[PDB]
Each structure stands twice: as structure tokens, then as C-alpha cells.
Design a protein around this ligand. Structure first.
Ligand SMILES: Cc1ncc(COP(=O)(O)O)c(CN)c1O
Ligand SMILES: Cc1ncc(COP(=O)(O)O)c(CN)c1O
Lengths: 428, 189, 428, 189
């Protein structure tokens, strides 16, 4: 039988491993090789049985059943199930009244699919910089983005942290713009006790198997505030001839998963909050900043590196990041980057080909972006590492404590971190 | 017997824990592709989560993009609209972009005869099997294949061909496994 | 969907709760009401899928498949799958050459089914006392119980602790007796690195769903050392006309469960060992004693109460036990008894009816058993509590730590334990 | 079709997590009993994990124990041996202890006609359904019922009828649920 089941339990790590030799220098790693796997999503008996239930019903009913179920929980007036998060965002934009040629304000830092939803709506992305702590669309650097073409602002609840809705909502009503959320990371994330996806005129949300609330492979959902938006998005599907329908198989997994979401979320919250608190004691690391009214879903956990420590004098930040990545990965914590380059400088937004002949892009004033336009986002990429699956998975206490030991172990070797970083060869 | 076979395959894949398209050690979609390549005698196969994805792949794969035209004499009302949305016109004088075969439980058994054709791009629509929206593009054209993958977000970015607009037309492994099973049960190796 | 899935995770308990007021006196319980449930057995996706595999195969093959699989792991030369542990013991006894009228030495403390296997073999149970620490058949007493009729000694690996095989085996070979193990609790328990069930000439083992290694409901297995025994047991089934066959459904669950047994056992071991170590620091409690060569399976965790503490001067032991039971249960640790009465004084061995007219019993000089014959076993019943499901389940760290806090909390209230115990009404 | 229905029931009960005979909130065995009581019009039902358990129950329930005798004219070679092992003799002058009906997939549909009879004790052997060894005893005799349960270790000891030798003839809920399903599919409301 082919199973992902982990056969070795994660032993409680000795607190004395903080004094141990680093694993990169032939030391004992905090997390042994056998204990480095995690299971995601959490596939239980319920999920297998749910397939046996749903298979007996009409596929469109299974999809409808899911859509309603999740909608009620989120608290969105209307919802459309779709094959992907990308398609949901596309339907969200169009539904909210984004027409061909319109400009849409988006953060430079997000997944490609955010912007490719804008281009799919035949609109032009206007990339903006991010706040250096929240990592979300910066409301301060937004005056300089507005034109006669600007129709909507599309903030991303990146990592799972709700973006500055209160500020961005004021900007939208002021300039008579529509607000479209990308909640593809913010499953169960809240602001003022309200779930992400209910704030904007519309919103899109990935329901892929790599998200805190996973469906059975590829899937997504679009939320709309007013019915006129929901109807327009439906009317677009009629006119466009696009088939963005969800698989019942995918929906079925969602139905069962939703019954157990709150359980997993609770472990996720307590695990993350503990790690924040522990990283607060470290000189080298700092966990994500969270506004008081906000609740982080912790799809991704981005850790800030203090590159300005004395030991890291004439060392460029990227070398520190790379060294820390190698050091942590040897200990067993797979820290990594989420986005290597900002969307402006991704090939699609360099060639500006779109549908062809640069269809969306030539329908408005051409923008040659440069790195100097996004200083905050670039500082983040140089001076942060990300934990993804390791805190998206609701890991047991022994595993969470292993993480805490790892950072505290590395925090006691800031000198060696510096020595290793300085030995890294230069790059473009 | 169908309900068991479907349940069994969904259980197997769910037990494996490998249900992401982009995940390493995912061999359900590759398995599906191989069967279809062997049946059609085509060299390249690209799976989609929508017939639209297969259509767009065949068009953009032959540089039939915004502003271009092709023959739409064999298109149904839906494809007509999709082409219009892409910004592609009609001409009777031009060749057809693809030959589309809607697969269902009636004709799945006789797939050899359907797929063995001279058509340079064969599009198979599996949606009516009832496992969810799915389509496969089959060709001997390497450039069509490469462009069809690159139009998908995470298609050949698993790590000449610069991508423009992109969509998520990645297929759910679970869905892919169900279709793979259905094919294997109905004669195909 | 009807599911046993627990929706509330067990919060990490504050270590300051050791100083808290007892829950019986209106204090906050260490374990909240919602966190008092445990799941057993551990039913996973693998188990559901295994049913879908096995259902397609001939039922007798599924049972054969299981029997061999588990046999190889245990390291027994021969094995017979059966419908129950009781039937396995019956087949074990007969297979080892126990004939009608023979006497079989058994502990007074065990489950009724041990003795009812002897009676089923048409043999006469000779009840003996137990060691006060291991709680297994006491080898020192075995001189006083041997007669010309005595054919076999049947020790029970009770709780999961291997019995004193070394001593009992010497006694058996000396008096040309057969040794028949009851390993119904000792799944994975070892002595000198060998699994329980391989030591005796034959052995029986429950595979019921309440055992560390569970099958899908009722089931058991008989092990035999030599083929002579295995053949006789098979020949008995032919002659007796008894249908003691196992269900494939039950076996199927075993096949999948066995793949993940070592994982669960490891958590079980580390959890138990930690609790022993922590109870060693307490003045009031003591965990199970374990010989050096032995490994406890911890199907049940029996805790000794120090009734000889000064605060418990003129307080009878049973009142201390009852008070501690009420105190612990209010905190959320459901400590209880396994056996309330010794088998001699169970109705079957008071009426001595057997098959009818006292068939087995009239074959031999009947002894009138009295409580003064089993002082050690009776001391245990008065001065121990048992945990059962709470440590048979491979509980998470948060839950195990909750237990440790509870005992340490109660250990700081030995005075109040005494006050509560003294207020309990007398019982004849 | 059968494979799915069987798998579905096993999945449902496994999902419930209630797979012990003696566990509270176990309603599969009670459900099985109720159906059989309604079909037979009998007041009492006792489930076993073996035909032997049903046989012993019917015998000991009528005080046919070691040293006693009964009519063995309608016994198969197996039950002949079981009676001998129990220490029960033959007499043509005495009545038969039970009427045994071997149930299978052929005759399960027509269970009303089989069970509607006027013997003291009806014994149903479900082993040949292929869910594992199982038998049910049906009677209007309360004393037979009570003695049949007391024979089983954990039969009504959930807390008069003094028990002698005992066996584990408790039925696996999982097995019970499969038979309950089979009955419901083939009529027998
Ligand atoms: C923020 C964000 N938005 C959108 C997407 C794409 O969503 P989907 O793959 O469900 O279309 C991703 C990546 N899965 C993402 O991280
Ligand atoms: C020592 C012992 N022997 C036998 C049994 C009964 O086994 P079964 O229920 O599988 O017949 C038990 C209790 N499960 C037991 O503790």
C-alpha cells in the first residue's frame, strides 16, 4: 500500500541542543533526517468516506453544496465556485465592473496569478510597493498611482495577514474605486472579527490543496458583495465562453475538510503565536508583525533577519540570507523564499504580450518599471526567510519546539553565521 | 461496479497523499498522458482542467493570438464565444486549428479509432465523463506542446518560449486518476 | 456525517495549576471537560482503503494473509487465527496437550476469559496469588499449588507487563508442565528482546478493538511453538465441531493497523516512561515496576497509592483509593479499576456449573477458596488505580503533560486527600 | 455494486469510530436484531460470531446441558460433533432443540417465508453471506434469550441467571452492519 504515513514520531528535542555544533559544520541537526517530513493536507477517514457519499450525487449538486457551505461560514452574500484561484480573481474583477482598458492597483510582491487575473480581465496592472512589516499593499504609496483609467484597487492578504482594509477602503470610496481582495492565503483570517473575502465589492480565493483550507487538487471561489456583481460575473461566463467550473471531486474534499477546519486553525494559531513570542527573545530573528484587529492565518511565516547587527558589517544582506538558509536547512528547518523576483520584472510583464500584440497593455500609457520604484519589497526579499508547509501543517508540540530550538541554536552562532556568509561568492 | 472503481481510485490517491498537480512524485497525470500518447501515436500531451485551456493551448501554440484568424466552421456556440474573447477572427480560406472529440461513456471504448487521425492537433474533452472539467491536447508539434505548458501557471516552470497572459488550467491529480482508471477499464492499456 | 473526530485541541496546561484548588472543591480542573475524550483505535484513511482492497479477495485468504503477517512479526513458528482471545486460549491449552480433568495454574487476578478458556478445555483452574509489584502470577507460591493432576501453568502478561517467564519456565520443565501464555494485553511487549507469545509451548492473544494492536471488532490468535501442538489444535476443531473462525473484516483492519503499530507503540512507550519518571518524584503515587529485561506494552497503567503516608494514619486503604478516584476524575483523569473481584469469587467459579452438573470440576478434588488465600491480589485492588484508555491511546504531549500536572497537583494536597477519604462512609 | 455497498457501510462505521461490541452508542447489532425480530415476529434476538454460539445458546437456554439429551435427527455432521463435545446425547422420543436455516445471497430475499414458522427456537446462519461467521437466535422464550446472552462474556454485564462456562461469541459491529445492510437491500424493511 502506497501511503504518506510517517512511521517515526518526532522525539522531544533536548533544550541543550542550543549549545550544539551547527549541522553545516558536521554537528548533530536539531531535527533528524527522519523527522523532516510533514503531511499536508490532513487527509483523514472522513475525507475518503466523503468521496463515497458525494460520488452518488449529481456533480453540479456536490459543487453547489460546497459553495453554499463555505459561503455561509465566510459570511459572503454571494459566491461562485471555480476551477482555480486565478479564475476566481478574474471573475471577481469583471463582476465588480472592471472593463477592458481599466487600470488596477496591485502590490509588486504577490503570486503571478494575482496580476494574470487583471490581464485576463483585459485590464492593466499598476504595481505598487508594500509596507516593510505587513508586506501588504502600502496605502501611503497610492496617490502616485491614480489616473483617469484607474478603476479598482486589488490588495493581497499575503501570507494570510489581512491587508490594511480600513486605509485602502477609504482610498477607494474617495476615488470612487472598487476593492477586490486576493484572499488566496487568508483562509479564516479576520479583521475586526470578519473573515477576509467579505470586505471588498468582490474577492477571489484559491482553494488549492496547498492552502490552509484545501480542496482535492485545483479549485477556487469568488465572493461578491452585491448581486449585480454576481450577475455580471455569471453573464461574463455566458458571453466569454470560458469554462471555469469546479470539479465535484475537488469540492467533495472541501466539504469534509470544512467540518474540521476550525480544529486545524486553532493548532495553527497557537503554534505560530508561540514561535513569534520565542523569536522575540532572539537577537537575530523576528516573526511577522500583526495589527491588533487582525488575525493571521499563517499560510506562510515570514521571519525578518537583523542584517544590521555588528557582526554583519561588510556583508551584503543577500549573503546573510543565503547562509542562514543553508544553516537552517541543515538543522532540518526548510526555510526558503516564496517570491524570488517582483511581478513587474517577471517575463509576462516585461514582454507585455498579454492576449497577443500586447492587447491589454497598449490600451493605456506604457510604464517602464525599475527596481528603485519598489525599495521596501526588495529589502524584504533580501532580508527575510519564509516557512511554508512547516507551519501551514498543524504540527505537534515536539515539532514546533524543534523549530524553536533551531532558531535559538542559530541565534547563539551569529558570529559563525557572519563567517559563513562572508565566504559565499558574489553573484549578479 | 462504477461507484466502487471510482471510490477505489480516489481512496488510493488520497491514501498516497499526493493530490497536488505541482507536487513531486505525482504520476497520475503522466500516466494519463502516456496512455493517450500511445493510443493516438502522438509524441506530446498536455492536460488541462478545462476544454478552454486545451483550445487556448492549440491556438496560441500555433501563434493564433489576438488579431489573428482561423477557420471556425466546426466550432459550437461556446468555442465561437471563446475565440471572440481571445480576439480571433474567422476565415473559410484558412485551415482549422484543431479537431475536437467530445469523449463520454458511449464512445470511450472506441478511442483508438477516434484518436488515430491525421489531425495535427487532437483535442479530447473528457468533461462528460462526470469526474469534473478536463481536456487533453495531443500533437507531434513540439512548439505547440511547449507553448501549451507555458500558458499554464506552473506548467514547465517546474525547472525561446516567452509567456504572455497565463491561466491556471492545471488538472487535479484526483480527477486525472479517475479518467486514467476509466480508460484502463474500457480496453485501452 | 457521524464522526468521532475531536474538534477542540488540548491546550498546553499551565504548570502553575499544581498550586490550584482541587476540582472537587470548586477549583478549575487540570483537563477541561471538552478535552477529556480520547480516540481508540486510531482509525485512519489507510484502514478504510484496506477494506476496499480486502473486500475483493476471498475471505479465507484475507484471514490467512493477516495470520502469517502478524506471525512473522511476533516470531512464532505456527499460528491459528480465531474469532476471539477466549477461543485462542482454548485452542492454545488443548494444542499444548491439556486434556479433560487436568489442573491448570492461573492467577486469581485476570479477566474471566482466562479461566473460562481453561474450563472450555475441560480443565480445572487452580487460582494462585500474584506478585505485589508486577501483578503477575507469583512463582514463589507455585510449590503449594502443584498436584498429580496439574498439567500446565498459564501466566497472564497483565497490563502488558511480561510475567516472570524465567522463573515459571524453570518450574514447568522441572515438573514436566506446559506453559501457556495469555498475551491479550502484551502486544509488542518483550522479554530479553523477544515478543510475548513465543515463550510458552502455546499462547493465546486477544486482538479485540480495545487492545494496543486492534482488529476490526472481535478477533484473536493462537501461537504454538512446535507443530505437534498446532496439529492437535487443528484436530480439535475437526473433532469438536466448534467454529472459531475469524472474520475477514476484522483481519483486514489488522493488516493495515500492523503497518502503523510500531509508530503508535513508540508514542505509547515514551508517554508511559515519562509518566513513571514524574510519578517517581511524587510522594503519593508510583508507576508500574518493570524488570530490567522486560518491556511494558502499557495497555493499562496501574498506579500504586502510598497508603502508609502519615496523613493517612487511621484511614482504611479503600477509602483513600475511592477519594483519590473522585479527586482525579474531577480533574479530568478518569482513573478506575480493571477488575473489582478476583476470579475465584466470580459466580462461574462459585456455582462451578461448567458445561452442566459441574462437568469439569467434579473430575478433581474441589477446593473452597477464601480471601485469605490471595493477600497480595487483594492489597492491589485496595491500593491501586488504573488508567486504561488514556495511555493505550498514543496521546499528544499536551495531554500527557496534563496528566503529569494532575498527579503533581493532587500530590500537593495529601492533607485534603486524607480529609476527604476520612469522610467516606464505611463499606462491608 | 455489492462491492460499493459493502465498502460504504464499512467506511461509515469506521468513520463513526464505534467498532466495539461492548461500547455504548453501538446500534448496529441492535439494528440487525430489530429487523430480524420484525421479520420473524419473534420477541427476542441474540447475535453470535459463530453458529456454534447460537447452537449452544439454544441448548443451554432449554437446560440441555452436559448429561442431558435431545433429538439430533436433523443435525449435520458438524453439529453432531458439537453436541458430543457439549456432552449431549440423542433421543428420537424428545423434540428437536431448534430449526436451523442457512442463509445466503440466494434465499436472503425470501426470509419472511423461512422465518415465519412455529418452532421454539429459530437459528439463522449468515456465515455464507461472506462477511465472516455470524448467527442469530430468535425466540419468544425470555428464559432462552437471557441464558443465551449470559453464555456470552459481556452479554448483559453492562451494570438471577447464574452463568457456568462462557465463551466470546460477541459479534463484530462491522460484521453486523454489513449483514444489516444486506437485509435492508433485499427487502425486510
Ligand atoms: C496569493 C496567490 N494567489 C493566487 C495563486 C494561484 O491560485 P490557484 O493556483 O488556485 O489558481 C497563488 C498560488 N497557488 C497564490 O499564492
Ligand atoms: C487476559 C485476558 N484474556 C482474555 C481476554 C478476552 O479476550 P477476547 O475478548 O478476545 O476473547 C481479556 C480481555 N479482553 C484478557 O484481559
Amino acid at each position: 500500500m502506497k501511503t504518506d504515513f510517517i512511521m517515526v514520531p518526532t522525539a522531544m528535542p533536548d533544550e541543550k541542543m542550543i549549545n550544539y555544533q551547527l549541522a553545516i559544520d558536521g554537528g548533530e541537526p536539531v531535527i533528524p533526517k527522519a523527522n523532516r517530513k510533514t503531511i499536508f493536507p490532513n487527509i483523514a477517514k472522513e475525507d475518503l468516506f466523503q468521496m463515497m457519499i458525494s460520488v452518488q450525487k449529481p456533480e453540479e449538486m456536490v459543487v453547489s453544496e460546497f459553495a453554499e457551505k463555505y459561503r455561509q461560514r465566510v459570511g459572503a452574500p454571494y459566491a461562485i465556485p471555480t476551477a482555480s484561484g486565478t479564475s476566481s480573481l478574474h471573475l471577481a474583477l469583471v463582476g465588480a465592473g472592471v472593463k477592458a482598458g481599466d487600470e488596477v492597483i496591485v502590490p509588486a510582491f504577490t503570486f503571478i496569478a494575482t496580476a494574470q487575473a487583471i490581464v485576463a480581465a483585459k485590464a492593466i496592472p499598476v504595481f505598487a510597493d508594500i509596507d516593510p512589516q505587513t508586506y501588504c499593499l502600502d496605502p501611503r504609496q497610492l496617490d502616485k498611482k491614480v489616473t483617469a483609467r484607474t478603476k479598482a484597487v486589488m490588495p493581497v492578504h499575503v501570507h494570510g495577514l489581512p491587508a490594511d482594509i480600513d486605509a485602502l477602503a477609504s482610498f477607494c470610496r474617495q476615488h470612487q474605486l472598487a476593492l477586490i481582495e486576493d484572499a488566496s492565503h487568508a483562509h479564516s483570517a479576520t479583521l475586526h472579527g470578519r473573515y477576509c473575502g467579505t470586505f471588498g465589492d468582490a474577492a477571489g480565493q484559491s482553494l488549492m490543496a496547498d492552502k490552509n483550507f484545501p480542496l482535492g487538487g485545483e479549485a477556487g471561489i469568488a465572493f461578491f458583495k452585491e448581486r449585480e456583481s454576481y450577475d455580471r460575473a455569471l453573464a461574463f461566463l455566458e458571453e466569454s465562453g470560458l469554462d471555469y467550473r469546479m470539479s465535484w471531486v475537488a469540492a467533495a474534499f472541501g466539504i469534509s475538510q470544512l467540518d474540521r477546519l476550525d480544529y486545524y486553525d486553532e493548532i495553527r494559531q497557537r503554534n505560530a503565536q508561540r514561535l513569534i513570542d520565542e523569536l522575540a527573545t532572539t537577537r537575530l530573528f523576528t516573526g511577522p508583525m500583526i495589527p491588533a484587529a487582525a488575525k493571521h492565518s499563517f499560510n506562510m511565516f515570514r521571519i525578518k533577519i537583523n542584517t544590521a547587527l555588528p557582526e554583519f558589517k561588510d556583508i551584503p544582506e543577500y549573503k546573510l540570507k543565503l547562509a542562514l538558509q543553508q544553516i537552517l536547512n541543515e538543522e532540518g528547518v526548510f526555510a526558503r523564499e516564496w517570491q524570488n523576483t517582483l511581478l513587474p520584472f517577471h517575463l509576462p510583464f516585461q514582454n507585455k504580450k498579454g492576449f497577443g500584440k500586447g492587447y491589454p497593455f497598449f490600451l493605456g500609457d506604457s510604464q517602464e518599471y525599475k527596481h528603485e520604484h519598489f525599495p521596501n519589497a526588495l529589502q524584504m526579499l533580501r532580508s527575510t526567510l519564509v516557512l511554508c508547509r512547516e507551519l501551514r501543517s498543524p504540527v505537534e508540540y515536539e515539532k514546533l519546539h524543534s523549530y524553536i530550538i533551531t532558531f535559538k541554536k542559530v541565534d547563539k552562532n551569529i558570529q559563525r553565521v557572519a563567517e559563513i556568509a562572508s565566504q559565499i561568492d558574489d553573484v549578479p | 461496479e462504477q461507484l466502487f472503481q471510482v471510490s477505489f481510485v480516489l481512496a488510493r490517491v488520497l491514501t498516497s497523499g499526493i493530490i497536488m498537480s505541482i507536487e513531486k512524485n505525482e504520476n497520475e497525470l503522466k500516466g494519463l498522458e502516456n496512455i493517450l500518447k500511445k493510443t493516438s501515436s502522438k509524441q506530446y500531451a498536455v492536460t488541462f482542467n478545462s476544454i478552454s485551456g486545451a483550445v487556448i493551448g492549440s491556438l496560441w501554440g500555433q501563434d493564433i493570438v489576438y488579431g489573428e484568424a482561423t477557420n471556425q466552421q466546426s466550432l459550437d456556440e461556446q468555442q465561437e464565444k471563446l475565440f471572440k474573447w481571445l480576439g480571433i477572427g474567422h476565415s473559410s480560406l484558412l485551415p482549422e486549428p484543431y479537431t475536437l472529440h467530445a469523449i463520454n461513456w458511449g464512445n470511450i471504448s472506441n478511442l483508438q479509432k477516434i484518436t488515430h487521425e491525421e489531425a495535427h492537433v487532437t483535442l479530447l474533452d473528457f468533461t462528460k465523463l462526470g469526474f469534473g472539467p478536463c481536456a487533453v491536447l495531443l500533437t507531434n508539434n513540439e512548439t505547440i506542446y511547449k507553448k501549451s505548458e507555458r500558458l499554464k501557471i506552473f506548467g514547465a516552470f517546474d525547472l525561446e518560449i516567452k509567456p504572455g497572459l497565463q491561466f491556471n488550467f492545471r488538472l487535479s491529480p484526483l480527477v486525472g486518476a479517475c479518467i486514467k482508471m476509466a480508460l484502463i477499464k474500457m480496453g485501452l492499456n
